[PDB]
Short mmCIF file of C-alpha atoms in Angstrom, two decimals:
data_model
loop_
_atom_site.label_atom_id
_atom_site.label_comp_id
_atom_site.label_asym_id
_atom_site.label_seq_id
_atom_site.Cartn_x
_atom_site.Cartn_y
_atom_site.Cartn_z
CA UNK A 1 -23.91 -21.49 -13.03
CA UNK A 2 -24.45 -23.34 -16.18
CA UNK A 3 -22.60 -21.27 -18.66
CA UNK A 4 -18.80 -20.45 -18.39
CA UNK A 5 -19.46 -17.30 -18.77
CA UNK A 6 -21.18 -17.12 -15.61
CA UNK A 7 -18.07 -17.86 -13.60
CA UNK A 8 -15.97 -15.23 -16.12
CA UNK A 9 -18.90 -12.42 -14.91
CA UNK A 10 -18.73 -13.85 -11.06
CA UNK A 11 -14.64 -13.53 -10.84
CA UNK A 12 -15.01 -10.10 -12.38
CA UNK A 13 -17.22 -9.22 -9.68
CA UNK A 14 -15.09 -10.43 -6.73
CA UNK A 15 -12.07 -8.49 -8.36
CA UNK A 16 -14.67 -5.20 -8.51
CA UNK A 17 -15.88 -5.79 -4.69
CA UNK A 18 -12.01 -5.71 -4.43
CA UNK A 19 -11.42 -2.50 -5.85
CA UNK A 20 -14.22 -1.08 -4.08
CA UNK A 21 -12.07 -1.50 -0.94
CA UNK A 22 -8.51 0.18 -2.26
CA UNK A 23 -9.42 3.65 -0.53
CA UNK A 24 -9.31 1.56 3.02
CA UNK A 25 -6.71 -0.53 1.87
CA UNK A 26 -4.75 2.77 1.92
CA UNK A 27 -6.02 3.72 5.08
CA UNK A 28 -5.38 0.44 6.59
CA UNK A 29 -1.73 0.13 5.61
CA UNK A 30 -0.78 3.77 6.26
CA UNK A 31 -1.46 7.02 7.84
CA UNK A 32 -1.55 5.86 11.15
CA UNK A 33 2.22 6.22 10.69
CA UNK A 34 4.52 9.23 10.14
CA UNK A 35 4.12 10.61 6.87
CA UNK A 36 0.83 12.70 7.92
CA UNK A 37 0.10 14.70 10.48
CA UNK A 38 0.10 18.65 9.46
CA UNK A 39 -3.15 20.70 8.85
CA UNK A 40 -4.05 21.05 5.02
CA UNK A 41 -1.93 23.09 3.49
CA UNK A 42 -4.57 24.98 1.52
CA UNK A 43 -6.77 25.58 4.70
CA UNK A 44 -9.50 22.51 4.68
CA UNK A 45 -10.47 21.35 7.70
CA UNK A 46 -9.43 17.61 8.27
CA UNK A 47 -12.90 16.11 9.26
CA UNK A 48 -11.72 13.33 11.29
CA UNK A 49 -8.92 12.37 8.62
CA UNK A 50 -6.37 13.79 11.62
CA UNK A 51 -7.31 10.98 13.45
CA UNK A 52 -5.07 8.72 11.91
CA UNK A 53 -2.01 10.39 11.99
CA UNK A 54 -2.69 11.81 15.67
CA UNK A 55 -3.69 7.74 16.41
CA UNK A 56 -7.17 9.42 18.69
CA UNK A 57 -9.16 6.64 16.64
CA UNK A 58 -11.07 5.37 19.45
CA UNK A 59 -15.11 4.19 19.95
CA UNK A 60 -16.79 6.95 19.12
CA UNK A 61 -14.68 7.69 16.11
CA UNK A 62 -13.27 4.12 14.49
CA UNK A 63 -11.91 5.80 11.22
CA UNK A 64 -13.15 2.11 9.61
CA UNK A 65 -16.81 1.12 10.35
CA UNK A 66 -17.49 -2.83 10.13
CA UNK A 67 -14.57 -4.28 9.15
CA UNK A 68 -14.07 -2.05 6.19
CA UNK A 69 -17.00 -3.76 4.64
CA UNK A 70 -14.91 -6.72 3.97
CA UNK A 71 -17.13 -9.00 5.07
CA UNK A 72 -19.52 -8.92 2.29
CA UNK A 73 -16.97 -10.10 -0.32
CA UNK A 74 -15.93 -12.72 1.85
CA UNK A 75 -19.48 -13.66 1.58
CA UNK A 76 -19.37 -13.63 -2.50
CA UNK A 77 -15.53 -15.17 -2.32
CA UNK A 78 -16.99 -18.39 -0.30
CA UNK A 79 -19.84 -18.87 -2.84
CA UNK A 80 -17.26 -18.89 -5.95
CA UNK A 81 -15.34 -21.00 -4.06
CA UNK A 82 -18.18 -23.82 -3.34
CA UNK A 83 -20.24 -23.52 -6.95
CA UNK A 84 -16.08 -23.51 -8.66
CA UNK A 85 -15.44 -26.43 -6.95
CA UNK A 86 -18.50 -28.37 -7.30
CA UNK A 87 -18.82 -27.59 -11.31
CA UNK A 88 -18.23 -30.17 -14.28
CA UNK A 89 -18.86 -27.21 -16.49
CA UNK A 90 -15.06 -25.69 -16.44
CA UNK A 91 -11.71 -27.14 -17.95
CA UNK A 92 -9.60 -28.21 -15.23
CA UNK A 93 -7.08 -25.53 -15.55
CA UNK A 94 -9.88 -22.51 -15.80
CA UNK A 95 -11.73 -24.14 -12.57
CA UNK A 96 -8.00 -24.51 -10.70
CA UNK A 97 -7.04 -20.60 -12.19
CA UNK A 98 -10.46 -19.38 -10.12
CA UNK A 99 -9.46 -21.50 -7.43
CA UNK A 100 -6.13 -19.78 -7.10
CA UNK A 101 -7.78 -16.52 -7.03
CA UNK A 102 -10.47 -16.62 -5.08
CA UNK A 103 -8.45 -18.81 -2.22
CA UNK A 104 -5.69 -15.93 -2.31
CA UNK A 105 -8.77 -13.34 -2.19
CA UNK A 106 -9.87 -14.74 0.71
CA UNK A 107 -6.06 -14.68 2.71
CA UNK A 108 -5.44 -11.25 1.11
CA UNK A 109 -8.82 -9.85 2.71
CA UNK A 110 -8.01 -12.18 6.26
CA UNK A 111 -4.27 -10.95 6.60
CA UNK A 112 -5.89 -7.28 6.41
CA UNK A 113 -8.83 -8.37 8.77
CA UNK A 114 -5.87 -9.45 11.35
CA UNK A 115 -3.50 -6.97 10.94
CA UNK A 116 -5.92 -4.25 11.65
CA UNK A 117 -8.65 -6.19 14.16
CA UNK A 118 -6.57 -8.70 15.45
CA UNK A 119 -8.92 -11.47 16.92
CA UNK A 120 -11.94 -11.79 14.04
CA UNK A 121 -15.22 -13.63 13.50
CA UNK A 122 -13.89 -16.79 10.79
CA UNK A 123 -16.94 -16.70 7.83
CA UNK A 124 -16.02 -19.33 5.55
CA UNK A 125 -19.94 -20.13 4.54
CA UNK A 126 -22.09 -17.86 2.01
CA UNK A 127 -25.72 -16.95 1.80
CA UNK A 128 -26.81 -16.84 -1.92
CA UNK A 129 -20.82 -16.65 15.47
CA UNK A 130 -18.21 -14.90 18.23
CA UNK A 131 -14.34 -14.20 16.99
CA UNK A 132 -11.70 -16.67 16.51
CA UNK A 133 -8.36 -15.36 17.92
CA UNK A 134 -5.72 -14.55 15.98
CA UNK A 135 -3.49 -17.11 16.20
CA UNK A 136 -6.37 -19.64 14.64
CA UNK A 137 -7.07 -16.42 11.87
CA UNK A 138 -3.44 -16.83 11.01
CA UNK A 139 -3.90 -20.87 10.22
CA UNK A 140 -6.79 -20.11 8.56
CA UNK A 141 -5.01 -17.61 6.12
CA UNK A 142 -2.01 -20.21 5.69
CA UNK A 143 -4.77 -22.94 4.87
CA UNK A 144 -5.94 -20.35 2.03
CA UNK A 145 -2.49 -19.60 1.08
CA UNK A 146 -1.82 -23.32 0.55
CA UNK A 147 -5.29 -23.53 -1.15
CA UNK A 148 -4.01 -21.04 -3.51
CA UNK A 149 -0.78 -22.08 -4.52
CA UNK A 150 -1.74 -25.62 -4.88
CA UNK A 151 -4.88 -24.97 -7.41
CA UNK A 152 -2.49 -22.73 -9.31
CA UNK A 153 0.49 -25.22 -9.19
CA UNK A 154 3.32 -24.41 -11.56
CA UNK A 155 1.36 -21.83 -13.76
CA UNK A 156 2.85 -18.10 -13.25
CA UNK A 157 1.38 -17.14 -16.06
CA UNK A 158 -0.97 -13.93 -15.36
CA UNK A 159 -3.98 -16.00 -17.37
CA UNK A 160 -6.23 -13.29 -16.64
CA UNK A 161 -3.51 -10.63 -15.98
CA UNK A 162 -1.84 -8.75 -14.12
CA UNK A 163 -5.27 -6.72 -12.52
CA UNK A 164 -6.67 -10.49 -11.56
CA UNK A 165 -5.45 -12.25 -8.84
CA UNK A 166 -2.21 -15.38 -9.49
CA UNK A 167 -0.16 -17.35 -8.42
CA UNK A 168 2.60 -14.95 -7.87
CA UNK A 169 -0.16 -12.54 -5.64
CA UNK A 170 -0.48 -15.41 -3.58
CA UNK A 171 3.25 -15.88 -3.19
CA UNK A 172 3.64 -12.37 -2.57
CA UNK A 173 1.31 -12.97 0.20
CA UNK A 174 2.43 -15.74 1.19
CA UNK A 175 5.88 -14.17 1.90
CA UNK A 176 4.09 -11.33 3.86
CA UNK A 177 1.95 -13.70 5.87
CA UNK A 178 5.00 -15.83 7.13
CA UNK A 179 6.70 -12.42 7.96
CA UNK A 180 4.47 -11.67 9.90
CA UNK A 181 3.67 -14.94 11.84
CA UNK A 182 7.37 -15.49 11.97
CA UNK A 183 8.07 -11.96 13.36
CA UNK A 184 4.81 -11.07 15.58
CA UNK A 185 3.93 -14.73 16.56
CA UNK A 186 7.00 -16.09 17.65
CA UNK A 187 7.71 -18.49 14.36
CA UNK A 188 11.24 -16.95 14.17
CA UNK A 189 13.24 -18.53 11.59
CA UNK A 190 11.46 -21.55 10.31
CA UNK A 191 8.84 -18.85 8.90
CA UNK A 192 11.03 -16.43 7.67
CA UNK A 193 13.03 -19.15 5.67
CA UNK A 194 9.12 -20.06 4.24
CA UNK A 195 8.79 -16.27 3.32
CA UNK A 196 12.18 -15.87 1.64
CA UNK A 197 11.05 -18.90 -0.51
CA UNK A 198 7.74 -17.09 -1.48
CA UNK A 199 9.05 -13.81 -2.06
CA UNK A 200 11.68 -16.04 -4.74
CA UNK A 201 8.98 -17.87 -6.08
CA UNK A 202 7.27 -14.13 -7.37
CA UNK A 203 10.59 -14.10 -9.68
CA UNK A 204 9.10 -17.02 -11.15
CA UNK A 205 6.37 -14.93 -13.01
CA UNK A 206 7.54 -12.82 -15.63
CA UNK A 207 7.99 -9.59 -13.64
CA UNK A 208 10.56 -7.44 -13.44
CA UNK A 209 11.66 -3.61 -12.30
CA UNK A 210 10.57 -0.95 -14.31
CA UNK A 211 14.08 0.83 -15.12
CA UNK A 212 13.17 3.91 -17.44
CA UNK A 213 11.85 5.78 -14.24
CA UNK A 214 9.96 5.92 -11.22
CA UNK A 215 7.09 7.88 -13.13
CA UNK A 216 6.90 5.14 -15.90
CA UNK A 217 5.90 2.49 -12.84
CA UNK A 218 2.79 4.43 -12.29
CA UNK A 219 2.04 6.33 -15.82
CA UNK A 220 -1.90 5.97 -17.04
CA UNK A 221 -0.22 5.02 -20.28
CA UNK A 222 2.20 2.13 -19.00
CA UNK A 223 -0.32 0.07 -17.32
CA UNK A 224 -0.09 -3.71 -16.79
CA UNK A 225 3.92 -3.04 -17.14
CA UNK A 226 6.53 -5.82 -15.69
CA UNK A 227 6.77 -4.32 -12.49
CA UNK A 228 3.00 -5.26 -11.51
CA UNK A 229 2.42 -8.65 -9.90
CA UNK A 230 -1.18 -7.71 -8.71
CA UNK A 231 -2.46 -3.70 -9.68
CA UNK A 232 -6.36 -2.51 -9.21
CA UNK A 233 -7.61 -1.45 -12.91
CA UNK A 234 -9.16 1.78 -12.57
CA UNK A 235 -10.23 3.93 -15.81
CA UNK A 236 -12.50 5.98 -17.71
CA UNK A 237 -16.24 4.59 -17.32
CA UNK A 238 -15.20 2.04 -15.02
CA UNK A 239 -13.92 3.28 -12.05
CA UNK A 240 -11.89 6.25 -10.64
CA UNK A 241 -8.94 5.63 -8.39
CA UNK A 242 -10.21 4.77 -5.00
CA UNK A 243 -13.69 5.70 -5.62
CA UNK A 244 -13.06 9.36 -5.88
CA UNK A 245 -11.13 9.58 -2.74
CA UNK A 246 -7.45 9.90 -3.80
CA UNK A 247 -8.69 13.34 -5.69
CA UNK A 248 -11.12 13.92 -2.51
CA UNK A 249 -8.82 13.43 0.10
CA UNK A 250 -5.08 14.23 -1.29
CA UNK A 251 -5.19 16.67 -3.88
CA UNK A 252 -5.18 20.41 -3.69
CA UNK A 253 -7.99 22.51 -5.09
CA UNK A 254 -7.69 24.12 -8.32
CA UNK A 255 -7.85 27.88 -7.04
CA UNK A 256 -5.68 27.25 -5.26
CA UNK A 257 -2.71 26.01 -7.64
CA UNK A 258 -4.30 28.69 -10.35
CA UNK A 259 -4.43 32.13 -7.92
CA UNK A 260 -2.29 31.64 -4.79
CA UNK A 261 1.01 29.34 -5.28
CA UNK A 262 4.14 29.45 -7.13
CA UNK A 263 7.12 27.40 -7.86
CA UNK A 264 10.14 27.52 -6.61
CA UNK A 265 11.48 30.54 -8.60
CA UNK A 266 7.83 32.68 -7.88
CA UNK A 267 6.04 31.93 -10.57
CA UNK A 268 2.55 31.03 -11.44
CA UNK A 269 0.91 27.31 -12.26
CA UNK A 270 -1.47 29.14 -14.85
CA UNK A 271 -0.16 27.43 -18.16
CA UNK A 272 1.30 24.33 -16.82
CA UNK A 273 -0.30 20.91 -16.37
CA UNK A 274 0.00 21.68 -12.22
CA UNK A 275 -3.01 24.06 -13.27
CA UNK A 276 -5.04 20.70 -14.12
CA UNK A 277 -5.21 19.40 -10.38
CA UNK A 278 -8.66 19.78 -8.62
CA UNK A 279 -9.27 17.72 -5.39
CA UNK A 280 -9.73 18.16 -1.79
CA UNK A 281 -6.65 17.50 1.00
CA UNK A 282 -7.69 16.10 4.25
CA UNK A 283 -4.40 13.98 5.21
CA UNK A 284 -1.59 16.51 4.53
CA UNK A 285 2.25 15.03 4.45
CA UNK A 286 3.94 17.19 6.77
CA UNK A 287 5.61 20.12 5.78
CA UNK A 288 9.09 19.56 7.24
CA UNK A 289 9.46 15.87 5.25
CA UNK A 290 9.90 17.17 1.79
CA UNK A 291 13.38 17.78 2.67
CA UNK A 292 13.97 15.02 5.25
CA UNK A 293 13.19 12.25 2.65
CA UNK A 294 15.30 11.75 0.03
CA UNK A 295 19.05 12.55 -0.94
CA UNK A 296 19.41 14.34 -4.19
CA UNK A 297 19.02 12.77 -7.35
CA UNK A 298 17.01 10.36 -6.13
CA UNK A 299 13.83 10.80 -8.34
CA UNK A 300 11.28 9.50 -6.25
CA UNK A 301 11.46 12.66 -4.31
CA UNK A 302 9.91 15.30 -7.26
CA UNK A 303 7.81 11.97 -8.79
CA UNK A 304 6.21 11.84 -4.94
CA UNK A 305 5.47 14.68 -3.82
CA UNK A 306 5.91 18.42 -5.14
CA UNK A 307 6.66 21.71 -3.52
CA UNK A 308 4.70 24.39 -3.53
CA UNK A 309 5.54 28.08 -2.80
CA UNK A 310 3.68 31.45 -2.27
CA UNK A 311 5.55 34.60 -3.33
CA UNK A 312 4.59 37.61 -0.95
CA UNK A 313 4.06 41.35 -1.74
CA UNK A 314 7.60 42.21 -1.33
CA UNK A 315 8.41 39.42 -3.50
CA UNK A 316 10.12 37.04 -1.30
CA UNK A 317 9.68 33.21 -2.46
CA UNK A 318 8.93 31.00 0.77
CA UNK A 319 8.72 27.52 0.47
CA UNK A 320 4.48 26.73 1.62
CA UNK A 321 4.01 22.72 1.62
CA UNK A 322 3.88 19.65 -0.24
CA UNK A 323 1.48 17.77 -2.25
CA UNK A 324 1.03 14.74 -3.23
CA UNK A 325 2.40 14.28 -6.38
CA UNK A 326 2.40 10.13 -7.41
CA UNK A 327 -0.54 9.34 -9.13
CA UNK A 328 -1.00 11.78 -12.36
CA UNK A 329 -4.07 10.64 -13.99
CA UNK A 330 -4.88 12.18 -17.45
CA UNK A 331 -6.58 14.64 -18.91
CA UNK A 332 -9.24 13.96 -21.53
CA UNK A 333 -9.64 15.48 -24.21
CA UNK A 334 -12.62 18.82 -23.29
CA UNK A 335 -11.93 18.83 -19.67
CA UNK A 336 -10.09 20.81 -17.74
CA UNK A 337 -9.53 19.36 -14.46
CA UNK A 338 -7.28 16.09 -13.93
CA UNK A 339 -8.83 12.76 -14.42
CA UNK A 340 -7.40 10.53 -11.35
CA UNK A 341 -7.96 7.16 -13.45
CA UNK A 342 -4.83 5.81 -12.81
CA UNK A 343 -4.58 1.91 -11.71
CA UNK A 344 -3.27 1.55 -8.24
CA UNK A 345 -0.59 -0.95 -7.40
CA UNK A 346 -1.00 -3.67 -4.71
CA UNK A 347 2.04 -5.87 -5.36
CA UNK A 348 5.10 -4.29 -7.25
CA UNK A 349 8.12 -6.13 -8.36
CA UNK A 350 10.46 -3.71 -6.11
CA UNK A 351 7.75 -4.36 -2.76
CA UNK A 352 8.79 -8.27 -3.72
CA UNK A 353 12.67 -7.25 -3.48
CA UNK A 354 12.59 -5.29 -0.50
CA UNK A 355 10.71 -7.72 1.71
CA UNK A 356 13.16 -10.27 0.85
CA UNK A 357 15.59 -8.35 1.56
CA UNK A 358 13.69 -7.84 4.89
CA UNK A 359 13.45 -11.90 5.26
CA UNK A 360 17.06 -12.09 4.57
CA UNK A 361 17.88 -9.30 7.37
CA UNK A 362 15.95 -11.38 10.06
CA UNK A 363 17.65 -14.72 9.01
CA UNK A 364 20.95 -12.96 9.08
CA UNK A 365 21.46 -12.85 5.43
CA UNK A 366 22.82 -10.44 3.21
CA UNK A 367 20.52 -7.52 1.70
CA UNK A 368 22.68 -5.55 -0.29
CA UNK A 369 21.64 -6.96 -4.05
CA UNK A 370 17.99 -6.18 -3.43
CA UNK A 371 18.70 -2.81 -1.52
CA UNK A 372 20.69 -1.86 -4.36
CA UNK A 373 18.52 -2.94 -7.05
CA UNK A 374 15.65 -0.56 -5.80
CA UNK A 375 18.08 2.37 -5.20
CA UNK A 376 20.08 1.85 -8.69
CA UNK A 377 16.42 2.08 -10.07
CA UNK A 378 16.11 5.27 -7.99
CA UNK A 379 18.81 7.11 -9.05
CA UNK A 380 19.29 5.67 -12.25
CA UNK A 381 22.28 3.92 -13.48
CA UNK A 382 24.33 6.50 -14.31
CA UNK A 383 24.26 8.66 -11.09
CA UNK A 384 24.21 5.23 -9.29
CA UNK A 385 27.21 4.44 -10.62
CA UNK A 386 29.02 7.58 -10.21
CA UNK A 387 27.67 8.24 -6.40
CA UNK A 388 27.82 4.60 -5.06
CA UNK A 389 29.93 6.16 -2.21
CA UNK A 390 27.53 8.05 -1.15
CA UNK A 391 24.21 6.89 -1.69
CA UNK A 392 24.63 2.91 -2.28
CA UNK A 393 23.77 0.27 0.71
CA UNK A 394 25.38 0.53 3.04
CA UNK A 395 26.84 3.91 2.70
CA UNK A 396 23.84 6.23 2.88
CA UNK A 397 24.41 7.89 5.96
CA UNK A 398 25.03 11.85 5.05
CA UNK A 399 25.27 13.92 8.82
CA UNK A 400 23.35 16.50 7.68
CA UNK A 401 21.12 15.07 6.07
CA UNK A 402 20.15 12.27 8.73
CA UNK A 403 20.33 15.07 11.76
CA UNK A 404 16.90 16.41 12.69
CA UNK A 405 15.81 13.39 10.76
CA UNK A 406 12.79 11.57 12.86
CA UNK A 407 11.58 9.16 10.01
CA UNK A 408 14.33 7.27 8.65
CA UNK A 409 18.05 6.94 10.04
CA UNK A 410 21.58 6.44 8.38
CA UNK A 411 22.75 2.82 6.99
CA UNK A 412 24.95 2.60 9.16
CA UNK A 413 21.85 2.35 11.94
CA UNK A 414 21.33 -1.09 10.74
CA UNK A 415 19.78 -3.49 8.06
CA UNK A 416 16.23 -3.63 9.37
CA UNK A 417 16.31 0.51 9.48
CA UNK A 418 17.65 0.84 5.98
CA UNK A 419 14.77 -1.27 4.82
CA UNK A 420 12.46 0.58 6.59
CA UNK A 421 14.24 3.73 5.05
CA UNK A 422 14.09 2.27 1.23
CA UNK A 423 10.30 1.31 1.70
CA UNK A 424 9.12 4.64 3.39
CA UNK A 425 10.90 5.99 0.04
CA UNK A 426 9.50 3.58 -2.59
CA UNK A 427 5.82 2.95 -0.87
CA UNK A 428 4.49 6.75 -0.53
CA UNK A 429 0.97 6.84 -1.14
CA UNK A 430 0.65 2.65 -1.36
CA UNK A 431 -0.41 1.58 1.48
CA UNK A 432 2.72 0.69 3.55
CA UNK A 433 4.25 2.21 5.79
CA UNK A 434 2.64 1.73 9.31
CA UNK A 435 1.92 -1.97 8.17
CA UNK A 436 6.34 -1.81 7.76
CA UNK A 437 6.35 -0.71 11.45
CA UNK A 438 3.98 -3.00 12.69
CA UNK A 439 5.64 -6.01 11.43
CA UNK A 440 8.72 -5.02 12.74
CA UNK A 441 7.11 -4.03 16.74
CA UNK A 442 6.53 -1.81 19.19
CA UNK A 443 9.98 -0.45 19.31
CA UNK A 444 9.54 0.77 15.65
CA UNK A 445 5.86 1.57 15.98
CA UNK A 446 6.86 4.15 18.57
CA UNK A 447 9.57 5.37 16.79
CA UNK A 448 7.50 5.87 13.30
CA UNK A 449 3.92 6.95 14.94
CA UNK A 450 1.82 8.40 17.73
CA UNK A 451 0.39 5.28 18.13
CA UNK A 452 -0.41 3.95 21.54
CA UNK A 453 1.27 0.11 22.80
CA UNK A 454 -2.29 -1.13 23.81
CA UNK A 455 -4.22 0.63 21.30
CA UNK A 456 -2.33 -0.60 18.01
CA UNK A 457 -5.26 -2.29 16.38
CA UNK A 458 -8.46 -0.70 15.12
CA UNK A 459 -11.60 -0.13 17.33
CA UNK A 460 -14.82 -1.27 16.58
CA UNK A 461 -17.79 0.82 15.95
CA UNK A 462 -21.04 0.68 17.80
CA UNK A 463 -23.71 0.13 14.29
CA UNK A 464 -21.09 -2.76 14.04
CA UNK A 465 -21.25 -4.87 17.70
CA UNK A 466 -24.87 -4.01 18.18
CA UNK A 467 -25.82 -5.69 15.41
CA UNK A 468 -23.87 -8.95 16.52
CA UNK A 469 -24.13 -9.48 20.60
CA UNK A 470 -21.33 -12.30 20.38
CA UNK A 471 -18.93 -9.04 19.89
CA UNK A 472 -16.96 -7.62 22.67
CA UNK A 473 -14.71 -4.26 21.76
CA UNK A 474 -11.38 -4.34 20.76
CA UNK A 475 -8.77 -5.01 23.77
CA UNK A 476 -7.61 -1.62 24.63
CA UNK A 477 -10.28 0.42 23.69
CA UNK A 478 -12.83 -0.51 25.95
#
């Protein structure tokens, strides 16, 4: 640590450990909820990927080993946190810019750690004993938070951009953190007015919704656009998109898009780009919620997810299952499968508008600007415009369309449902949606999942407590 460029190499590290840990990221924040839950379409077997969705983690079979291996960074985050602030080497605004980030590492990793173990074991040393409850895990992430935002001060500027950590990732935290306290700690509304104020300090940063289309926000070619506050780089020769395990756990196989499906008017995939996909589904979205949700026109719904179809003998077209659909890769030049090498979003400019619309809600303020930003973005202007009747806050609420409808309800079912609705919408694939649920309670955790009332944290696996006697199993799954 006597060169600059040792801290450059040390932050790019911590941001790689980071990356390392998108796949459970994923996992953490989402199919333990309602999107999941059918057998693979094209006939894998699951291999303990149905335990999510079916909420039979227990034990034996943790779906997470060890914390998610979070613990290690934590380790590497402490050390740049000591040798950063002890330098003389660094221009004050370089050593407060890695102060910002590795503080709000630190919280970002925490708020995981609590959401998903509850009461944890508080490392804040490094190297190169029992759990703290959660209550004290929650200071300790504010203390970060506070840590964060102070080193960074009044620069919004993405110095090191939008893939490293800043100021307006910590106040996107922030926002989520005092959500949380405020809703499942009993802060009530002197912590959601703190979170309203974070989630308006991200507009502060020079972010912004991406307008052209729902596929633009995600392209391999618009990367590091306005809508990104914090986004994992992935790419060719660095790193594939969750280590492999977007195409290994949510993508159909080749053979199967080439000899056995068809579209929705019976014809092959042989000639088309769909012909490109090669991956392996384990966590299937069911069946039934391709057309349970989204209204027409709204063109998240084909950007998400796609139908597929088989055409029988007697040529009769029958619609066969979904698949996922978001994240498109690229296809370099010589191959001939998909490359899945697209960056994967964290913090998005519309996840900052809907959760303050979701602060606003529980302080008994008015959502509709936000609500309607995200859906005018949806539709697009024009059929916004035209369709506002139908399809603008707070007038979604189609019969039909809602009836048979178990994961998302009309408007007219309230503020705190319509947000749920607009995120379940917006969020496929992110990370969200059974971290939405659990902010809100039990009430919508039992409405959204399969998930259990004492079981709604993660266990802990046996390599993990008998390595560290001071460790007693999760409450509940004893």
């Amino acid at each position: 640590w006597k060169n600059p460029d040792q801290f450059t190499a040390f932050n790019t590290g911590l941001h790689a450990l980071l990356r390392e840990k998108s796949y459970n990221f994923f996992l953490l924040g989402e199919p333990r909820a309602d999107i999941y839950g059918d057998n693979p379409i094209g006939g894998e077997a699951s291999q303990g990927m149905e335990r999510l969705p079916f909420n039979t983690i227990n034990k034996e079979n943790v779906g997470i080993s060890n914390y998610g291996d979070m613990y290690k960074i934590i380790n590497q985050i402490n050390q740049m946190i000591a040798k950063t602030t002890e330098t003389t080497i660094l221009t004050e605004a370089t050593q407060n810019y890695y102060l910002g980030e590795a503080y709000g590492m630190r919280a970002y990793l925490y708020f995981h750690l609590l959401r998903s173990w509850g009461d944890v074991v508080l490392y804040l040393d490094y190297t190169e004993k029992g759990v703290s409850p959660a209550t004290e895990v929650m200071e300790q992430i504010k203390k970060d938070i506070q840590a964060s935002e102070n080193a960074f001060g009044s620069d919004y500027s993405f110095k090191l951009g939008r893939h490293f950590w800043s100021a307006a990732a910590t106040q996107m935290l922030k926002g989520e953190a005092y959500l949380w306290s405020g809703r499942q700690m009993n802060g009530g509304n002197s912590d959601y007015t703190i979170a309203k104020n974070a989630f308006e300090n991200v507009k502060k940063a020079d972010v912004g919704l991406v307008t052209s289309s729902f596929k633009d926000i995600f392209s391999f070619e618009n990367k590091k656009n306005k809508e990104m506050i914090f986004t994992i780089h992935n790419g060719k020769d660095e790193y594939e998109m969750w280590g492999g395990y977007y195409r290994m756990r949510l993508i159909p196989a080749q053979d199967k898009m080439v000899k056995i499906y068809c579209d929705e008017n019976g014809n092959s995939f042989v000639g088309t780009p769909d012909a490109q996909l090669n991956g392996l589904t384990q966590l299937q979205v069911r069946r039934e919620f391709y057309f349970k949700g989204f209204r027409n026109n709204d063109t998240r719904w084909t950007t998400s997810l796609k139908a597929v179809y088989k055409k029988d003998a007697q040529g009769v077209v029958s619609y066969f299952g979904p698949i996922t659909y978001k994240f498109q890769g690229t296809m370099l030049e010589g191959g001939s499968t998909r490359s899945f090498l697209d960056d994967f979003p964290i913090y998005r400019y519309a996840d900052c508008l809907l959760q303050l619309a979701m602060a606003k809600v529980l302080l008994g303020e008015d959502p509709t600007e936000e609500i309607n930003a995200v859906r005018e973005r949806a539709y697009g202007s024009k059929y916004f415009n035209e369709h506002k009747a139908e399809i603008a806050y707070p007038n979604d609420n189609d019969p039909e369309f809602y009836t048979d409808n178990k994961w998302m309800k009309p408007d007219n079912a309230g503020a705190l449902e319509a947000i749920l609705k607009e995120r379940l919408r917006e969020f496929m694939f992110e990370g969200k949606r059974w971290y939405d649920i659990r902010l809100l309670g039990w009430d919508y955790v039992h409405q959204y999942s399969s998930a259990e009332q004492s079981r709604l944290l993660w266990p802990i696996d046996a390599g993990t407590l008998t390595n560290n006697s001071a460790l007693k199993q999760t409450p509940g799954y004893e």
